[PDB]
Each structure stands twice: as C-alpha cells, then as structure tokens.
Coordinates of C-alpha atoms in Angstrom, one line a residue:
Chain A
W1 CA -11.2 12.3 12.3
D2 CA -14.7 12.0 11.7
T3 CA -15.4 10.7 8.4
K4 CA -16.7 13.6 6.7
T5 CA -13.5 15.4 7.3
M6 CA -11.7 12.0 6.3
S7 CA -13.7 12.3 2.5
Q8 CA -12.7 16.0 2.3
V9 CA -9.0 15.3 2.7
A10 CA -9.4 12.2 0.7
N11 CA -10.8 14.9 -2.5
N12 CA -8.2 16.8 -2.0
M13 CA -5.4 14.7 -2.3
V14 CA -6.3 12.5 -5.0
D15 CA -7.4 16.2 -7.2
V16 CA -4.8 14.7 -9.7
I17 CA -6.3 11.8 -11.9
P18 CA -4.1 9.6 -13.8
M19 CA -7.2 6.9 -13.5
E20 CA -10.1 5.8 -16.2
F21 CA -13.7 4.0 -16.4
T22 CA -16.9 3.5 -14.5
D23 CA -19.0 2.8 -11.5
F24 CA -20.5 -0.3 -12.3
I25 CA -22.8 0.4 -9.1
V26 CA -24.5 3.3 -8.2
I27 CA -22.1 10.8 -5.6
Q28 CA -21.3 7.9 -8.7
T29 CA -17.3 9.3 -9.4
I30 CA -13.9 7.2 -9.4
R31 CA -12.5 9.3 -7.1
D32 CA -15.3 9.3 -4.8
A33 CA -14.7 4.9 -5.1
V34 CA -11.7 4.6 -4.2
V35 CA -11.3 7.0 -1.3
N36 CA -14.6 5.2 -0.1
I37 CA -13.0 1.7 -0.5
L38 CA -10.0 3.7 1.8
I39 CA -11.9 5.1 5.1
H40 CA -13.9 1.8 4.9
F41 CA -10.1 -0.1 5.0
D42 CA -8.8 2.4 8.1
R43 CA -12.2 1.9 10.0
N44 CA -11.7 -2.0 9.6
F45 CA -8.2 -1.4 10.0
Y46 CA -8.6 -0.1 13.6
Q47 CA -11.3 -2.0 14.8
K48 CA -9.5 -5.3 14.0
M49 CA -5.9 -5.1 14.9
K50 CA -5.7 -2.6 17.8
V51 CA -6.7 -3.7 21.0
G52 CA -7.5 -0.4 23.1
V53 CA -9.8 1.7 25.0
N54 CA -10.2 4.2 21.8
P55 CA -7.2 6.5 21.7
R56 CA -5.7 6.2 18.6
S57 CA -6.9 8.5 15.4
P58 CA -6.2 7.9 11.6
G59 CA -2.2 8.7 10.7
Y60 CA -1.9 5.9 7.7
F61 CA -5.0 7.4 6.2
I62 CA -2.2 10.4 4.9
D63 CA 0.3 8.4 4.1
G64 CA -2.0 5.5 2.3
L65 CA -3.1 8.4 -0.1
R66 CA 0.0 9.9 -0.9
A67 CA 1.7 6.1 -1.3
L68 CA -1.4 5.4 -3.5
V69 CA -0.6 8.5 -5.5
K70 CA 3.6 8.7 -6.3
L71 CA 2.7 4.4 -7.1
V72 CA -0.1 5.2 -9.6
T73 CA 1.9 8.0 -11.2
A74 CA 4.4 5.4 -11.6
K75 CA 2.3 2.9 -12.8
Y76 CA 1.0 5.5 -15.5
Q77 CA 4.1 6.2 -16.6
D78 CA 5.7 2.4 -16.6
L79 CA 2.7 1.8 -18.4
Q80 CA 2.3 3.7 -21.0
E81 CA 6.5 3.9 -21.8
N82 CA 6.1 -0.3 -22.0
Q83 CA 2.4 0.8 -25.2
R84 CA 4.7 2.6 -26.8
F85 CA 7.5 0.4 -27.3
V86 CA 5.3 -2.1 -28.4
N87 CA 3.2 0.5 -31.0
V88 CA 6.6 1.5 -32.1
Chain B
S1 CA -28.8 34.5 38.8
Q2 CA -28.2 37.4 41.1
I3 CA -24.8 38.0 40.2
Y4 CA -25.1 37.5 37.2
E5 CA -27.8 39.2 35.9
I6 CA -25.5 42.3 37.9
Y7 CA -23.0 41.4 35.5
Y8 CA -24.6 40.8 32.5
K9 CA -26.5 45.1 33.5
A10 CA -23.1 45.9 34.1
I11 CA -22.0 44.9 30.4
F12 CA -25.4 46.0 28.5
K13 CA -23.9 49.7 28.9
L14 CA -22.8 49.0 25.7
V15 CA -26.2 48.3 24.2
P16 CA -28.7 49.7 26.2
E17 CA -31.7 49.4 23.7
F18 CA -32.0 45.5 25.4
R19 CA -31.7 46.9 28.6
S20 CA -34.6 44.8 29.0
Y21 CA -32.9 41.9 28.0
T22 CA -30.5 41.7 31.0
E23 CA -32.3 39.4 33.3
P24 CA -33.2 36.0 30.8
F25 CA -29.4 36.4 29.8
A26 CA -28.1 35.6 33.3
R27 CA -30.9 32.6 33.9
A28 CA -30.4 30.8 30.4
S29 CA -26.8 31.2 31.6
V30 CA -27.3 29.6 34.3
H31 CA -30.0 27.3 33.3
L32 CA -27.4 25.6 30.4
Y33 CA -24.7 25.6 33.5
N34 CA -26.8 23.4 35.4
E35 CA -27.6 20.8 32.8
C36 CA -24.0 20.8 31.8
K37 CA -23.1 20.1 35.3
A38 CA -26.0 17.6 36.0
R39 CA -25.3 15.8 32.3
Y40 CA -21.9 15.6 32.1
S41 CA -20.4 14.6 35.0
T42 CA -16.6 13.3 36.4
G43 CA -18.6 9.8 35.9
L44 CA -18.8 10.7 31.9
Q45 CA -14.6 12.0 31.9
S46 CA -11.9 13.1 33.9
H47 CA -12.2 16.5 32.7
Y48 CA -16.3 17.4 33.1
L49 CA -15.6 19.9 35.7
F50 CA -17.3 23.0 35.6
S51 CA -18.0 25.9 37.8
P52 CA -18.7 29.3 38.3
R53 CA -15.3 30.0 36.8
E54 CA -16.4 29.0 33.4
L55 CA -20.1 31.0 34.2
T56 CA -17.7 34.5 34.0
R57 CA -15.6 33.4 31.7
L58 CA -18.9 33.4 29.8
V59 CA -19.6 36.8 30.8
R60 CA -16.1 37.6 29.9
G61 CA -16.8 36.8 26.6
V62 CA -20.2 38.0 25.9
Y63 CA -18.4 41.2 26.9
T64 CA -15.3 40.5 24.6
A65 CA -17.2 40.1 21.6
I66 CA -19.4 43.1 22.2
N67 CA -16.9 45.2 23.1
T68 CA -15.1 44.9 19.7
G69 CA -18.3 44.1 17.9
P70 CA -20.7 46.1 15.5
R71 CA -24.0 47.0 16.4
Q72 CA -25.8 43.7 17.7
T73 CA -29.3 43.1 17.4
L74 CA -31.0 40.7 19.2
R75 CA -30.4 37.7 17.0
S76 CA -26.4 38.8 16.5
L77 CA -27.0 38.9 20.5
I78 CA -28.5 35.7 21.0
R79 CA -26.3 34.2 18.5
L80 CA -22.7 35.8 20.0
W81 CA -23.7 34.1 23.8
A82 CA -24.5 30.6 21.9
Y83 CA -21.1 30.8 20.8
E84 CA -19.4 31.9 23.8
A85 CA -21.7 28.9 25.8
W86 CA -19.6 26.4 22.9
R87 CA -17.0 27.6 23.1
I88 CA -16.3 27.5 27.2
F89 CA -19.0 24.4 27.9
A90 CA -19.3 21.9 25.0
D91 CA -15.0 22.8 23.7
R92 CA -14.1 20.2 26.1
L93 CA -16.8 17.4 25.4
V94 CA -15.9 14.0 24.3
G95 CA -18.0 12.0 21.2
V96 CA -20.6 13.2 19.4
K97 CA -23.4 11.9 21.6
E98 CA -22.8 14.5 23.6
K99 CA -21.9 17.3 21.4
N100 CA -25.4 16.8 20.1
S101 CA -27.0 16.6 23.8
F102 CA -25.3 20.1 24.5
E103 CA -26.8 21.7 21.0
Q104 CA -30.0 20.5 22.1
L105 CA -29.7 21.5 25.1
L106 CA -28.9 24.9 23.8
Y107 CA -31.7 24.7 21.8
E108 CA -33.9 23.9 24.6
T109 CA -32.3 27.0 26.6
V110 CA -32.7 29.8 24.3
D111 CA -36.7 27.7 23.7
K112 CA -37.3 28.6 27.0
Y113 CA -35.8 31.9 28.4
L114 CA -35.5 33.5 24.8
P115 CA -38.8 32.8 23.2
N116 CA -37.8 33.9 19.2
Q117 CA -38.4 32.9 15.9
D118 CA -35.2 34.3 14.0
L119 CA -32.6 31.6 15.1
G120 CA -31.1 29.1 12.6
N121 CA -28.7 26.9 13.0
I122 CA -26.8 27.2 15.9
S123 CA -24.6 24.1 15.9
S124 CA -21.1 25.4 16.0
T125 CA -20.2 24.7 12.7
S126 CA -23.0 26.9 11.8
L127 CA -22.2 30.4 13.6
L128 CA -18.9 31.4 13.2
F129 CA -17.8 35.3 14.9
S130 CA -14.2 36.0 13.9
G131 CA -12.3 39.1 14.3
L132 CA -9.7 37.9 11.0
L133 CA -11.7 38.7 8.1
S134 CA -14.1 41.9 9.9
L135 CA -12.2 45.0 11.7
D136 CA -15.1 43.7 14.9
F137 CA -15.3 40.6 15.9
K138 CA -18.5 39.6 13.6
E139 CA -20.2 36.7 12.6
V140 CA -19.1 36.4 9.1
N141 CA -19.9 34.0 6.2
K142 CA -19.0 30.8 6.0
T143 CA -17.2 31.0 2.3
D144 CA -15.2 33.9 3.3
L145 CA -13.8 32.4 5.8
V146 CA -12.7 29.5 3.7
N147 CA -11.2 31.5 1.2
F148 CA -8.9 34.2 3.6
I149 CA -7.9 30.8 5.5
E150 CA -6.4 29.2 1.8
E151 CA -4.9 32.9 0.8
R152 CA -3.7 32.7 4.5
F153 CA -2.1 29.4 4.4
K154 CA -0.5 29.7 1.2
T155 CA 1.8 32.6 2.4
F156 CA 2.2 30.4 5.9
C157 CA 3.1 27.8 3.6
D158 CA 5.8 29.8 1.7
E159 CA 7.3 31.4 4.2
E160 CA 7.4 28.9 7.0
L161 CA 8.1 25.3 7.5
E162 CA 6.2 23.7 3.9
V163 CA 3.6 21.3 5.0
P164 CA 0.6 20.0 3.0
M165 CA -2.8 19.8 4.3
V166 CA -6.4 19.9 3.5
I167 CA -8.7 22.9 4.3
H168 CA -12.0 20.8 6.0
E169 CA -15.0 22.3 7.6
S170 CA -13.5 21.0 11.0
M171 CA -10.5 22.9 10.4
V172 CA -12.3 26.3 10.2
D173 CA -14.0 26.1 13.5
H174 CA -11.0 24.9 15.7
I175 CA -8.6 27.8 14.4
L176 CA -11.8 30.4 15.2
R177 CA -11.1 28.6 18.7
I178 CA -7.8 28.8 19.2
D179 CA -7.4 32.7 17.1
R180 CA -9.9 33.4 20.7
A181 CA -8.0 32.0 22.8
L182 CA -4.8 33.3 21.8
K183 CA -7.0 37.0 21.6
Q184 CA -8.0 36.8 25.1
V185 CA -5.1 38.6 27.6
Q186 CA -4.5 35.6 29.9
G187 CA -4.5 33.3 26.6
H188 CA -3.8 29.6 27.6
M189 CA -5.5 26.7 25.8
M190 CA -4.4 22.4 25.9
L191 CA -5.5 21.0 22.4
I192 CA -6.4 16.8 22.9
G193 CA -5.3 15.8 19.6
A194 CA -4.4 12.3 19.5
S195 CA -2.0 12.4 16.8
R196 CA -1.4 13.5 13.1
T197 CA -5.3 15.9 13.6
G198 CA -2.1 18.6 13.2
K199 CA -2.7 20.6 16.7
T200 CA 1.3 21.8 16.6
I201 CA 0.8 23.1 13.0
Chain C
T1 CA 9.4 -13.1 -14.4
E2 CA 12.7 -14.1 -16.0
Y3 CA 11.1 -15.1 -19.4
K4 CA 9.4 -12.2 -18.7
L5 CA 12.7 -10.2 -18.8
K6 CA 14.0 -12.1 -21.2
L7 CA 11.4 -11.8 -23.5
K8 CA 11.4 -8.0 -22.9
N9 CA 15.1 -8.1 -23.7
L10 CA 14.7 -10.4 -27.1
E11 CA 12.2 -7.8 -28.3
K12 CA 14.8 -5.1 -28.2
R13 CA 16.9 -7.1 -29.4
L14 CA 14.6 -7.9 -32.7
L15 CA 13.9 -4.3 -33.1
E16 CA 17.5 -3.0 -32.4
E17 CA 18.5 -5.3 -35.3
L18 CA 15.9 -4.5 -38.0
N19 CA 16.8 -0.5 -38.2
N20 CA 20.0 -1.8 -39.5
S21 CA 19.8 -5.6 -41.5
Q22 CA 16.8 -4.5 -43.4
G23 CA 18.8 -3.9 -46.7
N24 CA 20.7 -7.6 -46.5
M25 CA 19.3 -10.9 -48.1
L26 CA 19.6 -14.1 -46.9
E27 CA 18.8 -12.3 -43.1
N28 CA 15.3 -13.9 -44.2
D29 CA 15.9 -17.6 -43.0
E30 CA 18.6 -15.7 -40.1
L31 CA 15.5 -13.6 -39.1
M32 CA 13.2 -16.3 -39.4
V33 CA 15.0 -18.6 -37.1
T34 CA 15.8 -16.1 -34.0
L35 CA 11.4 -15.1 -34.9
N36 CA 10.8 -19.0 -34.7
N37 CA 13.2 -19.2 -31.5
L38 CA 11.9 -16.3 -30.3
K39 CA 7.7 -17.5 -30.6
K40 CA 9.1 -21.1 -29.4
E41 CA 10.1 -19.4 -26.2
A42 CA 7.0 -17.2 -25.5
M43 CA 4.7 -20.0 -26.6
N44 CA 6.3 -21.5 -23.2
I45 CA 5.4 -18.6 -21.4
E46 CA 1.7 -19.2 -22.5
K47 CA 2.8 -23.0 -21.6
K48 CA 3.5 -22.3 -18.3
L49 CA 0.2 -19.9 -17.6
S50 CA -1.9 -23.1 -18.4
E51 CA -0.3 -24.8 -16.3
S52 CA -0.3 -23.0 -13.0
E53 CA -3.9 -22.2 -14.5
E54 CA -4.0 -26.3 -13.1
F55 CA -1.2 -26.0 -10.4
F56 CA -2.4 -22.9 -8.1
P57 CA -6.1 -24.5 -7.4
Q58 CA -4.0 -27.9 -6.2
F59 CA -2.1 -26.1 -4.0
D60 CA -4.8 -24.1 -2.7
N61 CA -6.4 -27.4 -2.0
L62 CA -3.3 -29.0 -0.4
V63 CA -2.9 -25.8 1.8
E64 CA -6.1 -27.0 4.6
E65 CA -4.5 -30.5 5.5
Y66 CA -1.3 -28.8 6.1
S67 CA -3.1 -26.1 8.4
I68 CA -5.0 -28.9 10.0
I69 CA -1.6 -29.9 11.0
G70 CA 0.2 -26.7 11.6
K71 CA -2.2 -25.8 14.1
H72 CA -1.5 -28.4 16.2
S73 CA 2.3 -27.9 16.0
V74 CA 1.8 -24.2 16.5
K75 CA 0.2 -25.4 20.1
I76 CA 2.2 -27.9 20.9
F77 CA 4.6 -25.5 20.5
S78 CA 3.4 -22.8 22.7
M79 CA 2.9 -25.4 25.0
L80 CA 7.0 -26.0 24.9
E81 CA 7.0 -22.0 25.0
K82 CA 5.4 -22.1 28.0
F83 CA 7.8 -24.7 30.0
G84 CA 10.2 -22.6 28.9
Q85 CA 8.5 -19.3 30.8
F86 CA 8.1 -21.7 33.8
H87 CA 12.2 -22.4 34.2
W88 CA 15.3 -21.5 32.5
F89 CA 16.7 -24.8 31.4
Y90 CA 13.0 -26.4 29.6
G91 CA 13.9 -23.2 27.1
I92 CA 12.6 -24.0 23.3
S93 CA 13.1 -23.0 20.1
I94 CA 11.6 -23.2 16.5
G95 CA 14.7 -24.9 14.9
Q96 CA 14.7 -27.7 17.2
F97 CA 10.4 -28.2 16.6
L98 CA 11.5 -27.9 12.5
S99 CA 13.7 -30.4 13.2
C100 CA 12.3 -32.9 14.6
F101 CA 9.1 -32.0 12.8
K102 CA 11.9 -33.6 9.9
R103 CA 13.3 -36.1 11.3
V104 CA 9.5 -38.1 10.7
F105 CA 10.2 -38.6 7.1
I106 CA 12.8 -39.8 7.7
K107 CA 11.2 -42.2 10.3
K108 CA 9.0 -43.4 7.3
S109 CA 10.9 -43.4 4.8
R110 CA 13.0 -46.1 5.5
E111 CA 9.7 -48.2 7.2
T112 CA 8.0 -47.6 3.1
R113 CA 4.9 -48.7 4.6
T114 CA -5.3 -40.4 6.1
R115 CA -1.9 -39.3 5.5
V116 CA -2.1 -36.5 6.9
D117 CA -4.0 -38.3 10.4
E118 CA -0.9 -40.6 10.5
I119 CA 1.8 -37.7 9.9
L120 CA 0.2 -34.8 12.5
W121 CA 0.6 -38.7 15.5
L122 CA 4.1 -39.1 13.8
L123 CA 4.4 -35.0 14.9
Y124 CA 2.8 -35.4 18.5
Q125 CA 4.8 -38.8 19.1
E126 CA 8.7 -37.7 17.5
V127 CA 8.0 -34.3 19.8
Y128 CA 7.1 -36.0 23.0
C129 CA 10.4 -38.7 22.4
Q130 CA 13.3 -35.6 21.8
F131 CA 11.6 -33.3 23.7
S132 CA 11.0 -35.6 26.9
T133 CA 14.8 -35.8 27.8
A134 CA 15.3 -31.6 29.0
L135 CA 12.7 -31.9 31.1
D136 CA 13.1 -33.4 34.8
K137 CA 9.3 -36.6 35.4
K138 CA 7.0 -34.1 36.5
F139 CA 7.1 -31.8 33.7
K140 CA 7.8 -35.0 31.2
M141 CA 4.1 -36.5 32.6
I142 CA 2.5 -33.2 32.4
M143 CA 4.1 -32.5 28.2
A144 CA 2.5 -36.5 28.1
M145 CA -0.3 -35.4 29.7
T146 CA -1.1 -32.0 28.2
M147 CA -0.4 -33.2 24.4
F148 CA -2.3 -36.7 25.0
Chain D
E1 CA 2.8 -15.4 -37.1
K2 CA 4.2 -12.6 -34.6
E3 CA 1.2 -10.2 -37.0
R4 CA -0.9 -12.3 -34.4
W5 CA 2.1 -11.8 -31.5
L6 CA 0.8 -8.5 -31.8
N7 CA -2.2 -9.3 -29.6
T8 CA -1.1 -7.7 -26.6
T9 CA -2.2 -4.9 -28.2
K10 CA -5.5 -5.6 -26.8
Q11 CA -4.4 -7.5 -24.0
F12 CA -3.1 -3.9 -22.5
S13 CA -6.4 -2.5 -21.9
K14 CA -7.6 -5.7 -19.9
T15 CA -4.3 -5.0 -17.6
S16 CA -4.6 -1.6 -17.1
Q17 CA -8.5 -1.0 -15.7
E18 CA -7.0 -3.3 -12.9
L19 CA -3.6 -1.0 -11.7
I20 CA -6.0 1.2 -9.3
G21 CA -6.9 -1.3 -7.1
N22 CA -3.3 -2.7 -7.8
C23 CA -1.9 0.0 -6.2
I24 CA -4.4 0.6 -3.8
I25 CA -3.3 -3.3 -2.3
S26 CA 0.3 -2.2 -2.6
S27 CA -0.5 1.1 -0.6
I28 CA -2.3 -0.2 1.7
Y29 CA 0.5 -2.6 2.6
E30 CA 3.2 -0.5 2.4
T31 CA 1.5 2.0 5.2
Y32 CA -0.4 -0.6 7.8
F33 CA 0.6 -3.8 7.0
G34 CA 4.1 -3.2 8.1
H35 CA 3.8 -4.5 11.9
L36 CA 1.4 -7.4 11.4
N37 CA 1.7 -11.3 11.8
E38 CA 1.6 -13.6 8.8
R39 CA -2.1 -14.8 10.4
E40 CA -3.3 -11.0 10.7
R41 CA -1.8 -10.1 7.2
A42 CA -3.2 -13.0 5.7
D43 CA -7.1 -11.5 7.1
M44 CA -6.6 -8.0 6.4
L45 CA -5.9 -8.9 3.2
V46 CA -8.6 -10.9 2.8
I47 CA -10.7 -8.7 4.0
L48 CA -9.2 -5.2 1.8
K49 CA -10.1 -7.5 -1.2
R50 CA -13.8 -8.2 -0.3
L51 CA -14.1 -4.3 -0.2
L52 CA -12.3 -4.0 -3.7
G53 CA -15.0 -7.0 -4.8
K54 CA -17.8 -4.7 -3.0
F55 CA -16.9 -1.3 -5.4
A56 CA -16.7 -1.4 -8.2
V57 CA -12.8 -1.7 -8.8
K58 CA -10.8 -4.1 -10.7
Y59 CA -7.8 -6.4 -9.2
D60 CA -5.9 -8.9 -10.2
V61 CA -6.8 -12.2 -9.1
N62 CA -3.6 -13.6 -8.8
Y63 CA -1.9 -10.9 -7.1
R64 CA 1.6 -11.0 -5.3
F65 CA 2.8 -8.1 -3.3
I66 CA 6.2 -9.4 -4.0
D67 CA 5.9 -9.9 -7.2
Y68 CA 4.4 -6.6 -8.2
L69 CA 6.6 -4.1 -7.1
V70 CA 9.8 -6.0 -6.8
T71 CA 12.5 -6.4 -9.0
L72 CA 14.1 -9.5 -9.9
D73 CA 17.2 -7.2 -9.5
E74 CA 16.7 -6.1 -6.1
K75 CA 14.6 -9.5 -5.4
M76 CA 18.6 -10.5 -5.8
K77 CA 20.5 -7.8 -4.3
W78 CA 18.3 -8.6 -0.8
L79 CA 19.1 -12.3 -0.5
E80 CA 22.2 -11.8 -1.6
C81 CA 22.6 -9.9 1.2
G82 CA 21.8 -12.1 3.4
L83 CA 17.8 -12.1 4.1
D84 CA 15.9 -14.8 5.3
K85 CA 13.6 -17.1 2.5
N86 CA 10.5 -16.3 4.6
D87 CA 7.6 -14.8 2.0
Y88 CA 6.6 -12.3 5.0
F89 CA 10.8 -10.9 5.9
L90 CA 10.7 -10.5 1.9
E91 CA 7.5 -8.7 2.1
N92 CA 9.4 -6.7 5.1
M93 CA 12.4 -6.0 3.5
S94 CA 10.3 -4.5 0.4
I95 CA 8.1 -2.3 2.7
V96 CA 11.6 -1.1 4.1
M97 CA 12.9 -0.2 1.2
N98 CA 10.3 0.7 -1.5
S99 CA 8.6 4.0 0.3
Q100 CA 10.7 6.0 1.9
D101 CA 8.7 9.4 2.2

C-alpha cells in the first residue's frame, strides 16, 4: 500500500471527529498528525520486527485505526459521564 | 515490425483518416517491447517474461478500444495505445523504480516515433479508459469515475457482503484493469495482492 | 485503582445521602465527620502520589544494575539450553534456574557478611555447583570454560 | 474544604487532551504487540512514544497499558481463573479480551 493510499484510507477512517486542540508545530490538521503518527509507526514496525525479503503488507494498520476509533469513542463517553457526575 | 504494421493497417480500416500513422505505431510498439524485454529481464523477477504474444495482445487491445470507442483524434489514439501498452507491459512490473522506468520509456518511445505536443500526463493514473460510464470505451474524467464507483459501491455493499473500505486513487486504476480483463472474451487474470489489499473484494 | 474506585463510591454515597438528609439538623456534625474522613482518605491518595514522584525514579535507576545481572543470567541459560539441545539428558528449565538464583540470597543471609558484582558472581558459582551434576565430565569442563 | 476539593474540574481539561495519544498507544498495543517479546514490546514502546513526542500529541507519562485499559474487577477475575503473575501475561490476556472485532 502506497503511503498516499494509506493516508487516504486513514483520512476516510477518522472522518468521525471526537477530538479537539492544536498543532504546536506546523497541512496543519489534528487528524492528519494522528494518521502520520500511525503511518510512521506501521513503517517502523515492519522495519524493525519482521524478517523476510519484503513479502508482507500493512494489515495491522486497518485494525489499529478501527480499534482507535472504538476506544476514543468509549473514552469520550466515559470522560463526559465523569465530568457530568462531578458537575451535578 | 512488418507483421505488426500489417496488423495496424488491418485494424485502421475503422479510422482511415490516420492511414498514414499505421507504420509509426507498429515500430513504437516494437521499440517499447525491445526495451521492455531488455530492461526488465528474468534477472530482476521471475515473471518479467515478454514475447510476441504481448505485442499481439497490444494490437488486440487497441482494436478492442477503437471498435467500441468514439471517433478517435490523434491524441485519443496515442493515449489509447499508451493505455493498452501500460495494461500489457507495465501492470506486471514490481516496485516503483521500474514503473517510473516504463513511464519514461513510453515518453521516449512516443517522442521518438510520434512527434506531438498534444500529449498530457502519460502516467497510468492520469489516462483512464472505461466502458462503464460511457456507452463506448472512452477516456473519461477522474471525478466522474470516482463518483460512479462510490455510488455503485454503496449498492454493492448493501446487496452483497457488507464490507466498509475507502475508495482511493489506486483502487480506481485497479478496477479499470479488472474491468478490461473481464470484458475480453478469454478473460483470465492473476492478482498479486500480498494481503488485505482486497484483491478478493 | 482501589482508592479511586472507593473515591467514586464515597462521592456517590455522599451525593445520594444529600438529597434525603438536607432537612435534618444535628446532621451537620455527622456529615462533618463523614466528609472529614473523606478529606483524609483523599489526602491519602495525595500522599501516595507525592511518594510515587520519589519512588518511580529510584525504580528506574535500580533496574539498570539488575539488567546487567539479567543479561548474564539469560546467556548462561541459553548455554544450558544448548546443552539440552545437544543431548536429551542435559535438559534444563526456567524453574531450576530461578530456584538456583534464589538459593544465593539464603547463603548470604546466613553469612551476614559492588553488591551487584558480588551477587552476579554468586549466581555464576551457584549455577556451576548445581548444574554440574547433571552433566558428564566432558560437558562439565565445557560449561566451566564457557562460563569462565 | 470540599469547595476546595472541587479543583478536579480544572484537572479534567489537562487529563482530557492526552486521551488521544493514550488511545493511540492502546490501539497500537492491541493490534501489533500481540506476538512480541518483552524486550521487543519495550523497544517498540519507546519508538512509538518518541514518535508521539516528535508530534504535537499529548500522552500520559506514567502510562501502564494494564492499568489504563483493564478494570480492577476483570483484573481480579482473570487471576482468579488462573492467569499467571507476569505483567506480560496480563498484557496478553487484556489484548485477547478487550478488542474482539
């Protein structure tokens, strides 16, 4: 999967926007920074761990993205619940 | 070159206005071939194996795209030849270095035998020929194909197996390749998707 | 984690008790002692965090000497595992290695007596003493030379 | 004095801006770290943490995957069913149980 294609898929995955706040170091979008982190980690993972004459291709990337969405939604819900409790 | 010039003559009975361009198209097709077998040999990959059968496939693809295509201008003809040359020679290539090598080789061949300034981006991502949208096999716009694929993929996801995925730039070109493969009579094709690329889907 | 769970529990108890006992008087001092006990049980979390800010770096500094020990331990175990590879009787497990490594401190306790260096060398000595018996003279001397 | 204890309201905002990087670390664990050794996991953890540091993303400094994603009740249930003491085995069990898409 070409890095451009990976970024396209990651951008269409995090179209849900539970997150907020700035990019301290200048595109300059939050989700773009997150997907760049994920892409670089996928590349470094395939570079460091797996031994072999370059046969494999990113499959952990998709599952990681989906699990990240799931977990972020759960965490936003729980955090709002806690904040509401303490506010009342 | 002589045999395939005769082939190009025989297929250019559908567009006699370019009867003078029957020879340069053959030589170029041969020159491309002569280079494609030289640069990409069995030393690089086990499947870099070319033959006159590829030239026959190229002529056949040119004829198939003309016989069910609108009136072809010189630009349309050379871009059609380029599309089929890509689909026959370069789809089997591996890595990126070698794909750019073939792209520049196509540019060199065209510059050698077809002197024209009407060319655009000859890369496989810019020229797209599909019989899906148009009634005929015609070069269409990018955004048109993207929207068409999205709207058809929604229904394909609702009727058949439910699978969410992201339509990206490479998916369109690969879908076009699979379409031109499944359209011809004796359609057979093997995909080397390492995994999760969704060759199956 | 336990005091955080109990903190949420006590917050919920207090809140649910405030809806009913708002009209009661003399409840003042009772809720006073309640929330004061809560104040102390929360300053307990504060204390544990404060001492954690001092404890975690000590841990991250102590890990290095014991990793210096662990490298040698795992290489000796790899040697003994290759012994097991060569012949079927020289097999060796992790449990025996860990037991032999524990025996070293019992010996020092009885002795009553740079600590890292001495304990590493005691590891070597005890490994030789314990695992020399299940080998034949050839491999006895092989292990001796290799561990030296 | 309880009016004073209300300051966790201001602490919330600081605790929130880091949940993004924390969920990043957790998803990367769940997906990749399943088939990695202790040393391998530590090394890839350091790599991911420095990638998060080079980017403008907050993440919890005192971060423990186990404490972050497992609840105390499940952490008790697993051990009660016979899971080993190794933090490595706890991480493995948590990966097995939590995500099951």
